[model samples]
Target: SISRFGVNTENEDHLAKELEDLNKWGLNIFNVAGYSHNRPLTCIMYAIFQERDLLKTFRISSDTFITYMMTLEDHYHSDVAYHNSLHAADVAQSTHVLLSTPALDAVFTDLEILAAIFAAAIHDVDHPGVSNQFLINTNSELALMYNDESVLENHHLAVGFKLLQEEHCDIFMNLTKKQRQTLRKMVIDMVLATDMSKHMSLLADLKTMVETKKVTSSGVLLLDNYTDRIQVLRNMVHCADLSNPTKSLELYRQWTDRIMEEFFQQGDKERERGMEISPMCDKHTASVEKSQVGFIDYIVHPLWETWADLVQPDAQDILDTLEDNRNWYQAMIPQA
Candidate 1:
């Protein structure tokens, strides 16, 4: 009933082939978008089915899973250029790849893995194509509701978990009471960490983990405590959320274009309301290529560098792609 759910099954095999590339850093999610109807629903479902057997392990009924994912995808605003279902699908796929890092192959248990994937899939549901600063500047209800603290992330977690309350959409129906509560807490932490506001603390912990990393006899990470285990998962979803610049140029450009449009849209709104446009939101004054260079030089590179160290040698090629893509963007900056 893939077609019944408005998903394209014409190239399900092609999507399966795409999942093969999921273990690699540069898996072209764009191609999978071309092959499927709903990127988030299709990619997440296929990943749960193929990547780690999350569906089978959890004993999640296919009917419940499909409906739940469909509802989640619908909640993503197609009108928004960025933070749409495609972005969710991209982050979910990236989180899966990050979790697949060979160094930490068996480091995470099934519950933890499910939480990561679920967190990524629903991280940006109901996004309005505006920054949190824009929300607070507009004195929006969401900002007021959360007391200006991770407002968007709080909303995403609320809507994401709320959808599970529906009869057909309750994928966690099979989980024990304890399992449900634990997964909920972990999922909340993972999604909240996707907020850029939490970036510094999350990256700091990751850097510390790399230096203090304990290993098993056979070279596996020794995370013997909840703090250590959850810290790494937090960084994983955060890295996944910030993964665009680390992707191939072809894919990265598409993401950059979409996000810029979203920013410009916010800029236009601010103009109408007589509020100051936030940085990078003004398309007229924005130097796209230069800002991208600055973003890589500052935000993206440091986080990825630390992450690469944590999963050393495994992510070296991924880091290579990041630097290569950064230079490519830098070169495109119009010379003063």
Candidate 2:
């Protein structure tokens, strides 16, 4: 089936190797666009599921699983520069890496693991190339539909779950009613946790966990209660969503460029509509370096520092990269 995309044997072999190494250096799906149409993401997700034995556990036929992922990918907006399918794919891979940390081994059920990966896949489904505030200010249909509360997050859940109603993509059909219900609830919680408005609370909980965290005798994370367990999972996905700075500098720079462009586009729309411009959106006065530093210090560093403690040596390299990138940006700040 991989051959259907015309990938030569050599390339396919390399891709297989890369899939195995996904837990290591992050896979930038952006770098491999030359190899396939949109199938790389599908393949990467399939590999992750296969590696986890989830396909067999869930009884998801290969054909159905691949078809479902492909259809889901089709829904992501290609026109949106930052919140596109590639970002979703990246987040999914990052989530996989976090879930694979030895400290978290055996901590999650198969259903919860499935829910987390699915949440990453559809977290930003059908995102309209703008912030929720923009939608509210413009009185967009989505804002009205969601009553301006987690507008985009609510829509992502609605659209993603609606797609599962189609028989071809009903990968969860074989799951028991109880399993399905739990999975749905977990997915909803994880996806909603991705909303930026929830960032502060999520990070605060994460900080508390890091400060008062428990570990078993064997060094695995100890989550004695459902609330504690799900709290960690929520922060895990949130960490992956905000992991742009922890990536290699080249990749980090790429994300910064794309997101800033997207932000500026939103600013331009606000300017045209006679609304107040949001911070970091005014291209004329924007300083990418300063914004990056602020984001790292206030939001990113605190979260990852706590995460690094949670996962220990597993995330040390990531923290190191974050420090390196932060220093780079600090140097870029115009001399006062």
Candidate 3:
């Protein structure tokens, strides 16, 4: 009965072709598996099918979607552990599942649907493996250009649209000119909503929406406005993005390794530029235990708590994983 976004073995091949349209768009096309890579379409479709009614809502099958992901994986940048296509796919899937709210069913429209999925797939298409704070502090060109406001988020949006400009990448070509215009606007708003600085307002609005929530007689969410609906979804994806430190111990460690490596690389670049290194950038100052704890106590917990409030039981496991992971690092500090 899953009808929102159906994906089963029956029509997997067809879904593959659908996703192929995106590969030519120069956007995230990663489909690799194992190590940090995820099976893109598989993840997206699997998450979509979680909502029983939404299962049939999808026009494509699971296998085809996953196949398209495999094709995209070949192009994933190998430099970073996270922020690759795998992460994008995982986030997209996570976003989709989060939308299947019993309290907010039918709230989002088709345009919002497309925007959410597309944004998830392409949000971090070409992330440079460094935090925006790093770019701003270093006075990098991106920081200067964006004026230090959500630098990475801005660049990510542009890169996503730039890819669409290419003929091969115009996956939205199927839409009419008018539809494309609307889609562009929706996608931009949703993408920009992912910025951390906006996190507070985003959650506040979500809390308000939940308070005034509407649902069907059968107990499904009833979203009547596009902006309100899309904002929630946008914040959901952003939550998934910053969810690393609070994931499973194994997953958290993997992300930590990747992020630390990225920081070290930035430190190297700073050394070359004859600039001072940031706290986490240089390996010498890396008090891994202390930083990890601080990350959990400050940045990670507050955000995750807000998200957990939005999704309630769904986020508890993620929270549990995060706490467990934090303890793992905390215990290892003295030995290191």
Candidate 4:
């Protein structure tokens, strides 16, 4: 439905055909099925089966969401940045898997599931490939409009909402006027929560949430209120967003390359604008080894540790992989 998820920039045309060829792969790499093949169809089917008036905002057709994603795929210019549409799809898929665990099966409702899926797909739709502070310090329009607070998050919301206004791109088309209003609010809140600036506070809330969650007889996670619901959605996306380092060695290295390229480009732009260079932006001077070391130690480790605890059995191997990946980078320091 989304034109395609894995259109690697190097081969757009061949990759453009990737979406249709998905079923042949016998793989749901993007986990598009959850939203694409099933949920979207289920929404419409359930309405028909139950003979309910499916005319409200919640009556969104699967096709609308698919069109919305396809429009997004059209806009995504895969380049040197790590935050490409592929990453968005990856996060969305990972988020789905996380939500599907038996332990979580009964806790979430349909709306929350839809919210999380939609949120992940569009979280970084038009990312500039730089952190929020970069925009703020540079006086980028986004920074100015958002007052430097959650600048990237604000931009993401604005762009996503702007797209929703278009008839063809509007995934909420079936929803009535009031339904559109609610969908906009839910999507905005969910997407904005991905800004890395909120990671610590978000994780803190999640830790507290799972620790205190009441369980029903079925062992389903029970949320007593709206606050708890949002907290879980926020954490789920956060985990997916930061899952790079824990990927397999080859995949982790690929992400490292993309992130470095993004940082280097930012470095170049800063230099051209006569601004201060970011930590990993220097083309000639950037130390890939040292930069990765810091990224692993400060940014990657703690986050993985927490996620590892949350997903325990499933995430442990990934945690081990992270440690090994960190060591590989660390080992490279002496030689590089």
lDDT of each: 0.84, 0.85, 0.63, 0.64
Candidate 4 lDDT score relative to the true structure: 0.64
lDDT of 3 at 246: 58
User: Which portions of model 3 miss their true places by more than 4 Å?
Assistant: 1-32, 35-76, 101-103, 133-148, 200-223
Query: What lDDT tens digits, residue by residue, belong to model 4 across residues 1-336?
Result: 232234344433433333332322122333332333322222222222122222243665556655666566545556637776667766665666667655566676555666676677778877878778789888888888889998877776777677788887676666567655655666677787787777777767766665765666775666667677777677778777877777666766777888788888888888898988775688887778788778778867777676556544456776787899889888988764
- Tens digit per residue, CA lDDT, model 1, 147-229: 88999999999999999998889999988999999999999999999889888888887887899887677777788888888
Worst 10 residues of 3 by lDDT: 23-32
TM-score of each: 0.95, 0.95, 0.72, 0.77
Comparison by TM-score, 2 against 4, better one:
2
Q: Which stretches of candidate 1 lie over 4 Å from their true place?
A: 1-10
Lowest lDDT 10-mer window, candidate 1?
Answer: 1-10
Tens digits of per-residue lDDT, candidate 2, 110-227, equal 8888999989988998998899989998999999899999999999999889988988889898999999999899889999999989999888878888888787789898987778
Poorly placed runs, candidate 4 (over 4 Å): 1-63, 176-183, 210-220
Residue 210 error, candidate 2, Å: 2.5
